[PDB]
Amino acid sequence: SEESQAFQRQLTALIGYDVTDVSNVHDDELEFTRRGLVTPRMAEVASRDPKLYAMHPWVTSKPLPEYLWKKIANNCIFIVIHRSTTSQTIKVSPDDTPGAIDFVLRVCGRDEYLVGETPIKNFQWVRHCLKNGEEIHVVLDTPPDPALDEVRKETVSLWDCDRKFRVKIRGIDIPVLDLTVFVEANIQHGQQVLCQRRTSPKPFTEEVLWNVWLEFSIKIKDLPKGALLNLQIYCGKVQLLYYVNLLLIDHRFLLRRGEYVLHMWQISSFNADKLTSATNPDKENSMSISILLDNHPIALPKHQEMPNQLRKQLEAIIATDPLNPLTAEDKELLWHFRYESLKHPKAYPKLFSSVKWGQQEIVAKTYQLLARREVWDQSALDVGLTMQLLDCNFSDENVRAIAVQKLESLEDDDVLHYLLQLVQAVKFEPYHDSALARFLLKRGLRNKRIGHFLFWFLRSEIAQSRHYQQRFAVILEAYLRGCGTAMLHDFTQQVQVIEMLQKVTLDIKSLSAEDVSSQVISQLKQKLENLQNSQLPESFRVPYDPGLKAGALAIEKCKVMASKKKPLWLEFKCADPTALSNETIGIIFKHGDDLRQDMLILQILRIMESIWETESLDLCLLPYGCISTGDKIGMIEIVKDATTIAKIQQSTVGNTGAFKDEVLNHWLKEKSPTEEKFQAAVERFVYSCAGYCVATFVLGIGDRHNDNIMITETGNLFHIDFGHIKERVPFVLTPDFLFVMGTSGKKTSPHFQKFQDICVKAYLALRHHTNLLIILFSMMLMTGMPQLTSKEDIEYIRDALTVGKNEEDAKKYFLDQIEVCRDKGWTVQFNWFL
Ligand SMILES: O=S(=O)(Nc1cc(-c2ccc3nccc(N4CCOCC4)c3c2)cnc1Cl)c1ccc(F)cc1
């Protein structure tokens, strides 16, 4: 039809990629995945309560922390319900379910609802108000129409083959380039290379032919599902220059066969891009390789105590961190005591790394082993452990599926906490259709807030990653076909706004030399007025805060920043008349940088906060909204009432940097209305500073120049610009920070004794989740930093978290770091200014 044609055109423009396109395939996996995702979409759509879907209550079933209880007025919270101009105020108790006080309670100025069978202490908006110490303002409203969510009507056994595996390398071709070059062919399973063959070296001409069979030692019957033929091109120590990958057992369990011309990826170690089954879309410029797979259709089938010192050796092995390398001795031990090891969920990652995946009978015993998993199925969810099983070390669908099984029990509050890393982990899936892809699909469709962030996270990777754009596009399409017309319209509006603003960023960045022109400010405001009538939708959801709807631009307040990437400083009015403010919505619109590294670090900061909540600590971090939106384009939340530490020094002192200890402290008092609020500022500063000292040490991003650090007018310290990373320093504890606490060079202050108190406790709390943080750190580097990441980069966090050390000793180690910062004073800060 035509209605079912212009709708795909709509899907395409929302997705940023054409999913029906077959210009860059060599089998039908992508198309097979589209048809396969119809079923899980349908089930989730059909079983979601239409009413609860449309109001999307954002709820938690976690306990209310000790830091929030001490801020109640003894078992009583205040809720202001609203008329038109006036308002009524109700006395409430934390257990009063929405219905205890048709009509619905919508938060003033936000598409956020207080509805459903949960106590009001179990709402995030309520806990937000309580955290910042603000009154809850709501409106008696009409529930939205679920009709707006309406969804438009949518043979030889392999184990019977003793032949050794063989692949014919016909040769390579490249339109443009000289030394010597050879092709390496690896049977891979995860990062585990099972068998390796090389060709003879040949001269590197624009076309090089071999026509040789490479006979491997692995038999066909021993090929596991998810095994990759990985083809690499080395020039000559040698050097890797091109790689492509091909699945040996395709999506139907059929062995791969016939002719292949694969266009290959260029090189700029452990990196997610290296594992992709996607071929290079750049048909014109990219190197290709011509191969022949030949062996009748062959299909893989599906299937239907110990001594003292050894138990101890095994337990020591199970105890070690996820980055502790297993020796052959350890693996052989784990596998032999297979069934003892299965009694310990913590042993699953190491045990499944003890499996000889290239030996058919071993795999069979491994699948037998998984069939007997009462203990695994019974234990409480550990995200750490579960994440470990989704990383690049595991390619077995069954192994990976028992990880996804655990995630299924995750409450929506926590999916949101791990969504970004979960979406990144799709890049570790051998096949386009995986249990994890389906999990993300149905959790997103069950919940408008997960689905909103799912959209952007997926879209972020489609726009700037060729290596996985096809896979993420299919999954995104499957999502959009279930999210419902009311969300398709939001997405459409958001896409239009950022596409429009992009154009304005482009032409403006070119009109400036490498400060800021005066004409240019008027030139920007000129084009922004041009938009306000043009075709700009006069209300769109804020990508990083889907509660807020933005309306008209506040043109007068809009400017180009003094940064040499010339980002746009934009302000918007809230489209909601029910808003009881006036404060504009401030968004930084940036080109030049890829915001994905920033997204990752910030999300990890959030994870660190929720970690700290389990131990009733609130280190007042400020992880501001930051959404990559397109290719090298995104938005950043403007934090109100904030300035950079550096600018505070350029206000009292001046240019070069004769830094003074007092300058921060009396900046605080001049922005403090009273002594009452000034102390709360010093209070907020002690916590903030403690959070960012700990967080950044662990992540190894603590040494920042002080224009990249900010403070709010109420004490809240917070770091910025994470997407960038001699004598070193563990973090930033400069004298101006230290004097706010009341110390100079070598002393101890009451507020400082608190800083040391909170850090030590925050640090040790993180250490109780060593495994989880190690795994998120590993995954971050492998999927987020195109840094050809090494073990040594990863095994930094082993140092930072003082693995294998007692608590006493870990307290000492960090306290040394504090003292290291003291010794340097201003040496590192001045050193940047070269
Ligand atoms: O504008 S940027 O190009 N990008 C960017 C901005 C922010 C950010 C987030 C929230 C903010 N809230 C309030 C005020 C901000 N300002 C930043 C400094 O200039 C004054 C205004 C905020 C900035 C965070 N991360 C990045 Cl990558 C940039 C600018 C200066 C820097 F030193 C490095 C980066």
Q: Which domains does the chain have, with CATH numbers?
A: 1-154 (3.10.20.90), 160-296 (2.60.40.150), 297-484 (1.25.40.70), 485-640 (3.30.1010.10), 641-830 (1.10.1070.11)
Residue located nearest, by CA, to atom 10 of ligand 1? 638
Contact 421, 403 (CB under 8 A): no
Quote the CA–CA distance of 593 and 721 in Å, as a whole number. Answer: 10
SS3 712: strand
Quote the CA–CA distance of 661 and 681 in Å, as a whole number. Answer: 17
Contact 216, 166 (CB under 8 A): yes
State the pairing for strand pair 228-235/239-247. Answer: antiparallel
CA of 707 to the centre of ligand 1 (A): 9
Evaluate: CB of 512 within 6 angstroms of ligand 1: no
Q: Long-range contacts: 457-461, Cβ < 8 Å, 24+?
A: 457/419, 457/420, 457/423, 458/423, 459/15, 459/16, 459/629, 459/630, 460/595, 460/596, 460/599, 460/627, 460/628, 460/629, 460/630, 461/423, 461/596
Picking from 633, 671, 666, the residue whose alpha carbon sits closest to that of residue 652 is 666
Quote the CA–CA distance of 105 and 123 in Å, as a whole number. Answer: 13
Quote the CA–CA distance of 687 and 681 in Å, as a whole number. Answer: 10
Buried b (16+ CB within 10 A) or exposed e, 795-828: bbbbebbbbeeeeeebbeebeebbeebeebbbeb
Please give the structure tokens belonging to residue 194: 């099972």
Place of tokens 């699945």: 247
CA of 329 to the centre of ligand 1 (A): 52
Please give the structure tokens belonging to residue 230: 């990985």
Evaluate: CB of 713 within 6 angstroms of ligand 1: no
Quote the CA–CA distance of 334 and 318 in Å, as a whole number. Answer: 9
15 is in an annotated binding site: no
Contact 700, 728 (CB under 8 A): no
Place of tokens 């930051």: 626
List C-alpha distances in Å: 287 to 196, 260, 267: 22, 13, 11
Picking from 479, 460, 454, 404, the residue whose alpha carbon sits closest to that of residue 434 is 404
List C-alpha distances in Å: 368 to 325, 338, 361, 371, 372: 26, 11, 10, 5, 7
In one letter, which amino acid is 205?
T
Place of tokens 């195109």: 786
Q: Which residues contact 600 (CB under 8 A, 6 or more apart)?
A: 420, 421, 424, 780, 784
Quote the CA–CA distance of 84 and 61 in Å, as a whole number. Answer: 33
Contact 90, 78 (CB under 8 A): yes
Burial of 676 (C-beta count, 10 Å sphere; 0-12/13-18/19+): exposed
Q: Which residues contact 530 (CB under 8 A, 6 or more apart)?
A: none
Count the alpha carbons within 13 Å of 215 in the hemisphere toward its beta carbon. Answer: 2
Quote the CA–CA distance of 50 and 482 in Å, as a whole number. Answer: 12
Q: Which residues contact 676 (CB under 8 A, 6 or more apart)?
A: none
CA of 558 to the centre of ligand 1 (A): 15
Q: According to DSSP H, which parts of 320-411 are helical? A: 328-336, 338-341, 348-352, 360-370, 374-378, 383-388, 397-407
SS3 527: helix
User: Does the CA dihedral 339-345-346-350 come out positive or negative?
Assistant: positive
Quote the CA–CA distance of 24 and 283 in Å, as a whole number. Answer: 8
Quote the CA–CA distance of 776 and 385 in Å, as a whole number. Answer: 11
Please give the structure tokens belonging to residue 55: 């109001």
Contact 228, 245 (CB under 8 A): yes
Buried b (16+ CB within 10 A) or exposed e, 507-536: ebbeeeeeeeeeebeebbbeebeebeeeeb
In one letter, which amino acid is 198?
R
CA of 524 to the centre of ligand 1 (A): 19
Quote the CA–CA distance of 305 and 300 in Å, as a whole number. Answer: 36
Q: According to DSSP H, which parts of 140-227 are helical? A: none
Quote the CA–CA distance of 793 and 795 in Å, as a whole number. Answer: 6
List C-alpha distances in Å: 629 to 66, 476, 635: 37, 14, 7
251 is in an annotated binding site: no
Quote the CA–CA distance of 353 and 337 in Å, as a whole number. Answer: 14
DSSP state of 114: -
Quote the CA–CA distance of 453 and 447 in Å, as a whole number. Answer: 10
Quote the CA–CA distance of 354 and 16 in Å, as a whole number. Answer: 42
SS3 122: helix
CA of 135 to the centre of ligand 1 (A): 30
Q: Which residues contact 754 (CB under 8 A, 6 or more apart)?
A: 686, 741
In one letter, which amino acid is 458?
L
Please give the structure tokens belonging to residue 419: 């969504």
Contact 456, 626 (CB under 8 A): no
SS3 189: strand
586 is in an annotated binding site: yes
Buried b (16+ CB within 10 A) or exposed e, 242-254: bbbbbbbbbbeee
Burial of 454 (C-beta count, 10 Å sphere; 0-12/13-18/19+): buried
Quote the CA–CA distance of 78 and 137 in Å, as a whole number. Answer: 9
Query: To the nearest 10°, the Cα dihedral for 15, 20, 22, 27?
Result: 100
Contact 266, 286 (CB under 8 A): yes
Work out the number of other CB atoms within 10 angstroms of the CB of residue 264: 22
Evaluate: CB of 554 within 6 angstroms of ligand 1: no
Contact 568, 588 (CB under 8 A): yes
Buried b (16+ CB within 10 A) or exposed e, 41-70: beebbeebeeebbbbbbbbbeeebbebbee
Contact 532, 553 (CB under 8 A): yes
Q: Which structural technique was applied?
A: X-ray
Closest ligand 1 atom number to CA of residue 723: 27
Picking from 698, 721, 712, 707, the residue whose alpha carbon sits closest to that of residue 799 is 698
Evaluate: CB of 350 within 6 angstroms of ligand 1: no
Picking from 394, 466, 365, the residue whose alpha carbon sits closest to that of residue 775 is 394
SS3 170: strand
∠ at Cα 778 (777, 782), nearest 5°? 115
Evaluate: CB of 636 within 6 angstroms of ligand 1: yes
Distance from chain centroid for Cα 69? 31
Quote the CA–CA distance of 150 and 116 in Å, as a whole number. Answer: 21
Place of tokens 């004794």: 753
Helix, strand and coil content of the chain, in percent to the nearest 5, comes to 45, 20, 35
Place of tokens 């404060």: 583
Please give the structure tokens belonging to residue 1: 């039809």
State the pairing for strand pair 192-198/228-235. Answer: unpaired
722 is in an annotated binding site: yes
Residue located nearest, by CA, to atom 4 of ligand 1? 721
∠ at Cα 203 (202, 207), nearest 5°? 95
∠ at Cα 696 (692, 699), nearest 5°? 150
Evaluate: CB of 720 within 6 angstroms of ligand 1: yes
Please give the structure tokens belonging to residue 742: 């009341």
Contact 67, 618 (CB under 8 A): yes
Picking from 480, 409, 410, the residue whose alpha carbon sits closest to that of residue 441 is 480
Please give the structure tokens belonging to residue 525: 């405001």
Chain breaks in the chain (C to N over 2.5 A) after: 101, 154, 177, 236, 268, 295, 304, 514, 725
What are the two backbone dihedrals, phi and then psi, of residue 300, each rounded to the nearest 5 degrees? -75, 135
Q: Which residues contact 701 (CB under 8 A, 6 or more apart)?
A: 601, 719, 722, 725
Quote the CA–CA distance of 435 and 431 in Å, as a whole number. Answer: 10
Walk across the sheet containing 87-92 and list its strands.
87-92, 77-82, 136-141, 104-107
Work out the number of other CB atoms within 10 angstroms of the CB of residue 707: 16
Work out the number of other CB atoms within 10 angstroms of the CB of residue 80: 15
Residue of 720, 722, 724, 832 to mutate, ligand 1, most atoms within 8 A of C-beta? 720
Picking from 264, 138, 126, 241, the residue whose alpha carbon sits closest to that of residue 180 is 241
Evaluate: CB of 640 within 6 angstroms of ligand 1: no
CA of 638 to the centre of ligand 1 (A): 8
Contact 28, 85 (CB under 8 A): no
Quote the CA–CA distance of 624 and 543 in Å, as a whole number. Answer: 12
In one letter, which amino acid is 369?
L
Q: Which residues contact 451 (CB under 8 A, 6 or more apart)?
A: 444, 445, 479, 483, 487
Contact 108, 580 (CB under 8 A): yes
Quote the CA–CA distance of 516 and 285 in Å, as a whole number. Answer: 39
Quote the CA–CA distance of 542 and 449 in Å, as a whole number. Answer: 12
In one letter, which amino acid is 449?
R
What are the two backbone dihedrals, phi and then psi, of residue 512, each rounded to the nearest 5 degrees? -115, 145
Evaluate: CB of 644 within 6 angstroms of ligand 1: yes
User: Does the CA dihedral 51-53-56-61 come out positive or negative?
Assistant: positive
Contact 89, 78 (CB under 8 A): yes
CA of 721 to the centre of ligand 1 (A): 7
Picking from 167, 207, 199, the residue whose alpha carbon sits closest to that of residue 288 is 207
Element (H, E) at 288: strand 288-293
SS3 168: strand
| Structure resolution, Å | 2.5
Give the chain's largest Cα–Cα span: 85
